[PDB]
Symmetry: C3
Subunit: 136 residues, 3 copies
């Protein structure tokens, strides 16, 4: 694009989670996930179970383990720190979380995100990706 | 700077004029902003310029057409890499001299802060505080 | 960590450590009435600045600050304050630094004036604890 007939620098989102399918949901039937989510939420009412998987086609390192049991008051920012270290990202490498394809505030708590976004199996689902954008 | 006469550690922050507004009169900007917003309703036009005397690299271009859902944090990453910042180096946006949330979207900022020419105006800077 | 009872893959269990939860040395060093007089005086002298006590969460694996009393612009963000502290205590980009107000991490884009308006104590000081990631997992 160019217009004021100067060109725009066009920025475009790439390899967003969008409506990604989690391997966890493919691998385990609903009743098994729901029973597990119910039981871990009863066992630890002040913690939330979270599935973390990579956005398809994200140009980013693999995550060894996908199932997290997190204090409800833990911030997104603190969870970023732990996940970056599990992936062994360089400080200069981008990492963004998406819940339902929306990047959450770093000061949000995992409990706030869970209360708003947990699925019917009582898990919170987080996709991670790189910057997921180009054009500059 | 010393009742409780111990000295304070004093921090000091270090009026933005956009070259885009000096290059193009209001009527020309407004006509363009109107036209790009009609053509691409799920995109917003954004003027990005460097705070004067930020000791940070310049961008070649100031006019950006961005997805409404693009985050501040995503835009940060593209600029940091383009001007070769180290991970340790600071970069912030200022919209009406206020640093937005890194999770805020361009569409959210544009809805709240677009000027009457239908452009969102962003200044980028370093930490924009004096060294201690 | 622990196997799920039903979906038997292990959880990575995340645990907080060395959170503020905490007694400020500034409140030990100066009685209430002395702190209040000082806070009153500095707020009258500099209406567009706020006085802030910054102290390290006990056992945080992070450098101490030489000084605890800060006089900051009301418009200064948490993020701008982080940049200056990282430089002071020689933190690498990959090293964590978080603030806690009343044991809650504030938005990085929050201003010190916003935090002060909401959280200043009755001595007219805003109290900030700083820590490392304050979490581990396995």
């Amino acid at each position: 694009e160019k217009g004021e007939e100067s060109e725009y620098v066009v920025i475009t989102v790439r390899n967003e989670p969008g409506s990604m399918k989690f391997v966890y949901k493919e691998e385990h039937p609903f009743e098994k996930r729901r029973s597990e989510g119910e039981k871990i939420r009863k066992k630890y009412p002040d913690r939330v179970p979270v599935i973390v998987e990579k956005a398809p086609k994200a140009r980013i390192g693999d995550l060894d383990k996908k199932k997290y049991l997190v204090p409800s008051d833990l911030t997104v920012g603190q969870f970023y720190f732990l996940i970056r270290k599990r992936i062994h990202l360089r400080a200069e490498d981008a990492l963004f979380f998406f819940v339902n394809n929306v990047i959450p505030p770093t000061s949000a708590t995992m409990g706030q995100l869970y209360q708003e976004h947990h699925e019917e199996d009582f898990f919170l689902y987080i996709a991670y990706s790189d910057e997921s954008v180009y054009g500059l």
